[PDB]
């Protein structure tokens, strides 16, 4: 059993590239850590399309409801 956990930001091409670390091996399931910021929604949609066009291992995206953007330390502790 092999799994991958990675957070996402303004560069949505990070999780897809990271999923090839094992190369042809692949990973059993990779989960995406995301914030509530709207600047990453297009990245979220792109990642969803990538997962749909690359089926197989389970995929998921999670966005931080209370962390929209980094402003103070309280958001950091919540994250």
């Amino acid at each position: 059993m092999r799994i991958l956990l990675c957070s996402v930001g303004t560069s949505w091409a990070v999780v897809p590239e990271a999923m090839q670390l094992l190369g042809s091996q692949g990973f059993d399931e990779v989960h995406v850590l995301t914030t509530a910021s709207s600047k990453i929604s297009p990245g979220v949609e792109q990642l969803l399309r990538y997962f749909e066009m690359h089926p197989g291992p389970r995929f998921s995206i999670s966005r931080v409801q209370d962390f929209e953007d980094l402003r103070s330390e309280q958001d950091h502790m919540l994250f």
């Binding site: 990271a18 670390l21 995301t34 979220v44 969803l48 998921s60 995206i61 999670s62 966005r63 931080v64 409801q65 209370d66 502790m77 919540l78």
Partner: protein, 454 residues
Amino acid sequence: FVRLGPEPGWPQLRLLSAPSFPLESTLQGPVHWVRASDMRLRQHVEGVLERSRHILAAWEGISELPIPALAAWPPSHLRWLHEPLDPVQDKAWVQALPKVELHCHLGGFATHGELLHKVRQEAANPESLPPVRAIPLPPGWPIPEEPIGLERYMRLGDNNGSALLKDPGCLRAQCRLLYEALLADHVAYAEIRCSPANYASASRSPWVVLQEIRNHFQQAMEETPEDRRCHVNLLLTATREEGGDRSRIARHLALAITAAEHWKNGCRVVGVDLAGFEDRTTRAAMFATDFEPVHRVGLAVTVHAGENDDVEGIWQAVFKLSARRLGHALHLSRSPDLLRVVAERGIAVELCPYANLQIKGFPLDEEQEGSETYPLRGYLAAGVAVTLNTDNLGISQASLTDNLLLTARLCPGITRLEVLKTQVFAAQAAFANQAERKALWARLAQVPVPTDTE
């Protein structure tokens, strides 16, 4: 790609499971919207890391800690432990220690006052109660302005004892009140020494009295939650009364040998506490095969080195009665050979600060240690297993906490770690078996954290 290497983890944080701290997530199509119920996990992690840091910091030198569970204490608290004890500020912390009692006579628990009246009004034959006599206490009690003597100290307890305890109701009141007094002082193990024959009657044989006492204590133990249950065993007293009377001594030894097997759970009879008085006619060679049977069956013996035994008693008892504890061995430093034989053989010494002060008298509130200084620290230095007890609660009018705090006045410079060491020695030198010892050790690990730290 760049590989940062494996992360083996943290021992107390690699076993955690998701359900313990669930994550709430709201579904919106293909993206899960997680949510944090609380930051309990952060506090859990911080506590784990702090406890780990304390363990590692105090790890090097765990052999010096009386309790191995003290390695989780903060380093500031470990420094605090190694300082001198204070009778004024440390009332609460001492009051919170789970202590051990090993020298507590049942015949002097309510010798005076509200407890005496509570015992009297519980008698089953109110018109048979002896009149409450007049026994004025010496001035300054419980800290006499001069030593009062063993005879007077014993006479102070006339209101209670054989005068009243022959009545079953008074006996039950005595037992219940004694157990309550133990619980109110946070005692995790006790050994109450009784004299069943002294409480016998025409219709009440000594065995019946002993059975009633044991069953009263067992009942009191049964009703208390197991977290605060003070396991109480019994010691039979074979008093060396003058004149040569051996009927009561023989009866007590036989009763002990019988009770040793009759009961095997809860309150039990674990040994005898031969007084072996001093007056060159009883001593400790009174053995005469008297204590041969008690050894033959696996019982323990604990002498009562009196108010002037002078090294000969402390040897006659150790090497001829096979005593495993010694009471009031205050002149032990005389012979440098006994202070080494006791240390090597592991014979515990039971001390009573308040009783010793009120009878023999000692210098108080001294800055340094002189010739007459209380021998607590002298005994501890040589390696002896010194223990602190209460003797007679009612007569001494001071609980276990009062006795513990009086050491800081009797022995200058006494530290808190030495108080903990005395508690551990008392626990380890008790006559319990594996179950009682295991319960006592589990109860001892819960040392109350200091309120100040500085």
